[PDB]
Amino acid sequence: SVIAKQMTYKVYMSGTVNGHYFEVEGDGKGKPYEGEQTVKLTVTKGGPLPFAWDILSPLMSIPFTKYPEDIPDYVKQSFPEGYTWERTMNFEDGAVCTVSNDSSIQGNCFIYNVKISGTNFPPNGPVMQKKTQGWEPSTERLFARDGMLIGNDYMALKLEGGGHYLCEFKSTYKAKKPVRMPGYHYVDRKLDVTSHNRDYTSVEQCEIAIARHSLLG
Amino acid sequence: SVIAKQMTYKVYMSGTVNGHYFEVEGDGKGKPYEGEQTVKLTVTKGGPLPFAWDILSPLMSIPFTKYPEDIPDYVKQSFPEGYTWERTMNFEDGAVCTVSNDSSIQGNCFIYNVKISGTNFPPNGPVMQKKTQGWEPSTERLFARDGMLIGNDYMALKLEGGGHYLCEFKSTYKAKKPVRMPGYHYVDRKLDVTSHNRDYTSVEQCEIAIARHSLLG
């Protein structure tokens, strides 16, 4: 097993949202087998960002998911060779982000290369007016198809003054070598911003991610 | 007590799928506060149906959901006046159904009026070829907006041979008077066809439904 009980990672993010180019670099660590991690992000280009930080936070570490012994762990099995993923984020006011990731390993250090293209955020909307206050806890539905893992997740941003702003995640995770596939299952997650400077050009995040069966049956 | 701890209901369904008209009538009973119910359905017009029974099974009973004390029960509070809902079912092969419900109560019997319009089921697809083998248990994500309950569920039909046929549920539930709105939460469900005749003109189903918060602290 190339995945130690304690691990670090580096994330390199680049892309455009509503035509605004930026780069973010991150240093993370955690306990992959406990589904616990933390990351320090720096906006290295195009900060301060003109859009809500929250739209980037779930793009900056699926090896840090607690899997029980009876549910094959697609992502961890992929190492050392690693995996890629693609994701679409469909926001309820019509905006879309497309994201691609390539993940690899270097000693005790995962390396994530992530690219985002986001468009059609209304200038009106809570993303460009920064009215978001973090994501609700969520549950990804996962199942195996043609040797890839398909993920779906109904995510929701909390809005300044009470309501929610919805975002549908669709994810395709692809190991760079075939691995043992899981059955139909779920991952419960909780993602929080745990620190920031005033303009969110320096940010830290905590995540907890635990796989499980369906609760009923 | 508006809603008794042992209740019956009557379901009246009519609609069109790929232009085929049909009517279904049901007698149900269960324990609304324990999230347990059974129903006996008869296809009274247009039988035998030329499409998989499974696409109708989740359209014929949200009063029968076990809610814990701390999560407001939107649907039970709406009685005796009742509620309406609208649901879209979006299948991954481009098939779609739109559904509308109106519900009320009469003594110890709920009355459900449901109308469905479905189309675009391909002739060699699993619905028109009757290759489906029931729904996976699922989890509906619910939250409050402008006195209404918004629900989203990532559903999956099991197929002959072992894959899945995905369907996205989007639901809007509307109480007929103002009630105490719940916070963001989940309902887990398991729906089984427990008995049927060969052409599915007589069918019995069982359902379990339980509300909760996220599993993570």
Side-chain angles (χ1 to χ4, degrees):
Chain A
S1 170
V2 295
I3 296 167
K5 293 184 142 166
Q6 293 221 109
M7 220 79 173
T8 73
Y9 60 92
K10 191 96 183 172
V11 34
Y12 300 96
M13 173 179 282
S14 72
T16 305
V17 171
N18 271 27
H20 182 90
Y21 182 83
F22 65 96
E23 291 176 10
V24 176
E25 289 187 12
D27 290 295
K29 55 171 178 193
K31 307 196 228 278
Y33 301 92
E34 309 304 310
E36 292 176 355
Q37 67 186 315
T38 63
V39 64
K40 329 170 171 223
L41 294 327
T42 302
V43 182
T44 50
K45 205 107 88 197
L49 302 173
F51 53 80
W53 175 267
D54 288 333
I55 69 167
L56 298 186
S57 59
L59 308 181
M60 301 180 287
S61 192
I62 62 185
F64 298 78
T65 308
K66 185 167 166 160
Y67 265 82
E69 271 173 18
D70 69 317
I71 297 182
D73 191 330
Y74 187 84
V75 167
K76 295 194 179 65
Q77 291 180 80
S78 68
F79 285 95
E81 289 86 354
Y83 67 86
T84 67
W85 59 257
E86 287 185 16
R87 177 177 299 159
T88 67
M89 299 161 71
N90 287 120
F91 296 83
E92 63 170 312
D93 59 353
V96 37
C97 293
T98 60
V99 190
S100 57
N101 169 109
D102 183 296
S103 297
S104 58
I105 194 166
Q106 202 144 120
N108 253 47
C109 190
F110 298 112
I111 302 155
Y112 310 139
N113 282 280
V114 49
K115 296 198 178 163
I116 171 177
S117 160
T119 189
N120 292 136
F121 290 96
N124 271 271
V127 172
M128 299 312 290
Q129 297 309 309
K130 298 185 194 178
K131 296 175 144 114
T132 70
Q133 304 185 329
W135 294 98
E136 291 286 4
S138 75
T139 309
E140 187 179 31
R141 184 282 301 283
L142 291 153
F143 77 102
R145 184 176 281 180
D146 301 319
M148 303 184 302
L149 202 66
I150 317 304
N152 291 92
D153 197 339
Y154 280 116
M155 297 273 279
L157 281 166
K158 293 171 277 179
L159 291 177
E160 162 167 314
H164 286 98
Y165 175 54
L166 299 189
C167 187
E168 181 215 350
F169 280 22
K170 317 180 95 216
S171 303
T172 300
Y173 311 94
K174 195 183 313 208
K176 282 160 173 196
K177 42 110 188 264
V179 300
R180 183 135 189 239
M181 305 301 288
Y184 199 93
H185 79 280
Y186 295 94
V187 174
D188 297 310
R189 289 186 177 92
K190 187 165 192 286
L191 174 59
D192 285 299
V193 171
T194 61
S195 96
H196 63 85
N197 58 9
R198 179 181 305 266
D199 62 353
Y200 285 77
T201 62
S202 272
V203 180
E204 298 182 46
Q205 307 191 163
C206 284
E207 187 180 290
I208 206 295
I210 305 185
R212 64 160 167 86
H213 297 283
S214 155
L215 294 170
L216 268 35
Chain B
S1 211
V2 185
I3 297 173
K5 244 137 266 46
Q6 181 72 25
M7 213 89 155
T8 69
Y9 59 94
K10 190 83 192 202
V11 48
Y12 295 107
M13 179 187 266
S14 71
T16 309
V17 171
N18 278 22
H20 181 93
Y21 181 79
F22 62 92
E23 298 181 357
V24 180
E25 302 194 353
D27 301 303
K29 67 180 205 192
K31 297 202 234 287
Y33 294 93
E34 302 324 296
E36 292 162 18
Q37 61 179 323
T38 70
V39 61
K40 179 207 195 302
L41 288 325
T42 305
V43 178
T44 50
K45 217 110 86 200
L49 299 173
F51 54 80
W53 175 260
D54 284 334
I55 71 171
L56 300 186
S57 61
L59 307 185
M60 52 219 171
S61 182
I62 61 189
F64 302 76
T65 306
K66 175 177 184 72
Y67 266 83
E69 270 182 8
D70 64 311
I71 306 171
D73 194 332
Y74 185 78
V75 162
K76 286 194 186 59
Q77 289 181 78
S78 74
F79 285 95
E81 297 91 335
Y83 62 84
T84 65
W85 53 258
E86 305 271 16
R87 173 172 304 157
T88 60
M89 309 170 46
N90 282 128
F91 298 86
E92 58 176 322
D93 54 355
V96 46
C97 304
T98 63
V99 184
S100 65
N101 166 288
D102 174 82
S103 302
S104 57
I105 194 174
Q106 197 168 119
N108 294 321
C109 197
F110 300 106
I111 304 177
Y112 310 143
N113 306 94
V114 46
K115 250 287 189 78
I116 177 168
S117 182
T119 195
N120 257 51
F121 292 101
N124 303 316
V127 169
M128 304 307 298
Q129 290 301 323
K130 297 181 169 170
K131 295 303 184 193
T132 66
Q133 305 188 345
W135 298 92
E136 292 292 354
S138 67
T139 304
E140 190 180 29
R141 182 281 307 278
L142 300 141
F143 75 90
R145 174 173 297 180
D146 306 331
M148 296 187 292
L149 212 58
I150 309 309
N152 285 105
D153 198 333
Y154 282 120
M155 295 276 273
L157 282 163
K158 292 172 289 174
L159 296 177
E160 183 175 286
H164 286 90
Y165 173 53
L166 306 174
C167 187
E168 181 190 13
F169 282 22
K170 304 185 149 220
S171 303
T172 303
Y173 312 98
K174 280 133 96 181
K176 280 172 179 167
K177 51 123 178 298
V179 304
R180 187 182 161 203
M181 299 301 291
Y184 195 94
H185 72 280
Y186 303 97
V187 172
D188 311 292
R189 288 192 178 87
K190 170 175 202 280
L191 172 63
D192 294 302
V193 176
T194 57
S195 134
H196 65 88
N197 67 5
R198 191 168 89 98
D199 63 11
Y200 281 88
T201 52
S202 305
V203 183
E204 298 181 29
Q205 314 187 157
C206 286
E207 185 195 298
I208 299 301
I210 308 174
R212 63 173 173 81
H213 308 288
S214 156
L215 282 190
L216 307 171

